[PDB]
Amino acid sequence: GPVPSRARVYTDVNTHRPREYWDYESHVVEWGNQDDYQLVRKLGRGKYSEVFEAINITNNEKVVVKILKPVKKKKIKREIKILENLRGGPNIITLADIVKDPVSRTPALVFEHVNNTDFKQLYQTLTDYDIRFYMYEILKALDYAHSMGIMHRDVKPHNVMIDHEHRKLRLIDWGLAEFYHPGQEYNVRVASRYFKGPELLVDYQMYDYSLDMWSLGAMLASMIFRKEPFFHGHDNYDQLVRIAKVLGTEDLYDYIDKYNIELDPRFNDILGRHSRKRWERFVHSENQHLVSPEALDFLDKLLRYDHQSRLTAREAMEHPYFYTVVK
């Protein structure tokens, strides 16, 4: 069968916790007062919930209310427990309250408001300095979560709220997040297509925090190369092929061979034989101002097939790409 894998950092953190920390099924939800909140505008309807802008009529604070839907009910307490576990951490969205919506009769999570600009428009305006600055801010959130025994599993531009006026960033939507336990097998049907790590695409279930570092790399590549998305697959199978056309097939085979993983046989007729490309292949007059040797080296160390070989969030924060960022 597959060779096992463990995280190379924060490996054992949950084992030292009281069971209550990670045993989210046993969590008793604490409820606030739904009458404190007035919905103002529906902002969207994800897979699992409807999201609204609202006002806390008690303090006049703008808030965001996510009225939970789901059919995998376990996700309710998992998200709540993860949010409570991470509350107060750097760049982690703050869960302000949990109320029972009287119409849906389901929990509604109340979050702090962040004044965001649509990433498709915003990313066209980020300078080189800004990309470095905000990447560093995302890393603070990821390293905090990972240090707390949690993987986000859905890192993507839509889940990074940026108030660019105030240079404020929050990592949101912890509904796919999980507790990391060594040796545990996880669902590979997580993350959005363009951000799924190779471990998901080859059906390797014993993954870890390093999944989030792939997704961060895929975001970074889109930002520095002005290519949205960077790896633009039509489906989850073609998604792997798009990755292999950049990173090469030999290193893909080495990865699956290391873990004694066999590709879905449907790859036989679509994967082909591709060399690893040099990153300069993607540089052109329109993105050159965002590219530097340090950016390319950092990216190269995030976008690795072998999840164990990727930079950790803390290693990433040590990288020369961030030396120019004021701290």
Side-chain angles (χ1 to χ4, degrees):
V3 168
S5 177
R6 293 178 306 145
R8 295 174 71 194
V9 291
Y10 310 126
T11 312
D12 301 322
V13 296
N14 287 317
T15 201
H16 299 289
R17 292 285 182 176
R19 172 172 293 265
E20 290 68 28
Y21 183 81
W22 51 259
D23 181 21
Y24 62 83
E25 306 165 31
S26 303
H27 180 68
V28 179
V29 174
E30 285 193 5
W31 303 92
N33 193 340
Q34 183 272 341
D35 49 294
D36 288 354
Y37 303 101
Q38 173 89 359
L39 310 176
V40 177
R41 294 193 306 166
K42 189 156 55 167
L43 292 181
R45 169 187 296 155
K47 309 174 198 59
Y48 303 99
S49 53
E50 279 192 342
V51 174
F52 299 81
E53 178 174 350
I55 175 172
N56 181 328
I57 68 172
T58 290
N59 55 15
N60 274 333
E61 290 296 315
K62 302 180 57 175
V63 297
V64 171
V65 178
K66 174 155 79 170
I67 301 180
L68 303 174
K69 267 185 189 181
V71 300
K72 306 203 63 46
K73 292 166 167 176
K74 75 164 168 56
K75 280 178 80 284
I76 295 176
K77 288 188 177 187
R78 189 179 66 186
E79 180 174 2
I80 284 165
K81 189 63 183 180
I82 285 173
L83 287 164
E84 290 187 1
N85 285 349
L86 300 180
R87 185 154 53 203
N91 299 339
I92 304 299
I93 199 69
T94 296
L95 180 63
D97 213 344
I98 307 168
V99 301
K100 186 151 298 187
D101 187 78
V103 178
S104 72
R105 317 204 305 163
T106 66
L109 305 183
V110 182
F111 297 94
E112 82 189 311
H113 181 259
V114 183
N115 191 25
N116 181 67
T117 303
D118 172 43
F119 76 92
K120 285 192 181 182
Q121 176 180 300
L122 179 64
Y123 291 5
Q124 301 281 347
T125 75
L126 299 179
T127 65
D128 176 32
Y129 187 83
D130 291 325
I131 296 171
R132 299 173 192 231
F133 178 93
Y134 290 124
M135 280 277 155
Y136 195 79
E137 295 299 295
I138 300 164
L139 287 166
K140 290 178 185 169
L142 290 176
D143 183 56
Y144 185 72
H146 298 169
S147 78
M148 295 290 285
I150 291 157
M151 48 184 167
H152 184 285
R153 310 197 303 175
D154 196 27
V155 171
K156 60 181 180 174
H158 329 54
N159 289 337
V160 176
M161 292 296 95
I162 301 179
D163 180 343
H164 190 45
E165 195 178 349
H166 297 105
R167 300 187 69 80
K168 175 183 179 179
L169 181 146
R170 299 290 181 263
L171 181 55
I172 71 159
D173 207 347
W174 298 79
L176 281 182
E178 255 294 9
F179 295 91
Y180 178 66
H181 293 284
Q184 183 159 321
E185 293 188 320
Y186 295 93
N187 189 3
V188 298
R189 294 179 52 103
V190 297
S192 269
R193 184 188 312 146
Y194 307 142
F195 301 91
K196 289 172 184 281
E199 53 271 56
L200 310 181
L201 301 174
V202 304
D203 207 15
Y204 186 73
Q205 295 184 264
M206 203 175 294
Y207 62 77
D208 60 67
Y209 316 114
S210 59
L211 173 63
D212 293 333
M213 301 307 295
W214 175 277
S215 301
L216 190 69
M219 287 183 42
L220 182 62
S222 75
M223 296 165 77
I224 72 176
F225 296 131
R226 293 264 188 90
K227 184 181 184 309
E228 180 177 17
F230 186 73
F231 295 119
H232 197 163
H234 290 234
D235 60 36
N236 294 334
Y237 308 107
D238 184 58
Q239 187 66 29
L240 186 60
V241 180
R242 302 301 179 132
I243 295 166
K245 284 178 173 190
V246 180
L247 295 189
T249 48
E250 295 288 39
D251 282 343
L252 174 57
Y253 283 111
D254 285 350
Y255 171 51
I256 64 173
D257 291 352
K258 169 172 173 184
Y259 295 97
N260 288 32
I261 297 166
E262 204 183 345
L263 288 184
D264 187 330
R266 96 181 66 192
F267 285 106
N268 291 2
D269 300 322
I270 61 170
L271 183 57
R273 298 206 286 175
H274 302 286
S275 53
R276 200 147 190 139
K277 307 307 187 292
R278 298 193 199 266
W279 290 109
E280 288 76 17
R281 170 72 68 90
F282 305 98
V283 180
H284 53 62
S285 68
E286 287 70 44
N287 64 28
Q288 170 74 258
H289 64 295
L290 305 175
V291 175
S292 59
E294 292 78 12
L296 294 182
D297 183 68
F298 179 47
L299 181 66
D300 189 57
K301 289 171 162 65
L302 295 172
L303 293 180
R304 298 269 195 239
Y305 291 116
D306 186 351
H307 52 279
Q308 291 183 1
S309 70
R310 301 176 192 140
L311 294 176
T312 70
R314 280 294 293 263
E315 289 179 310
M317 294 169 78
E318 299 290 289
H319 192 277
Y321 183 61
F322 302 110
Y323 292 168
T324 195
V325 175
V326 165
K327 7 230 172 333

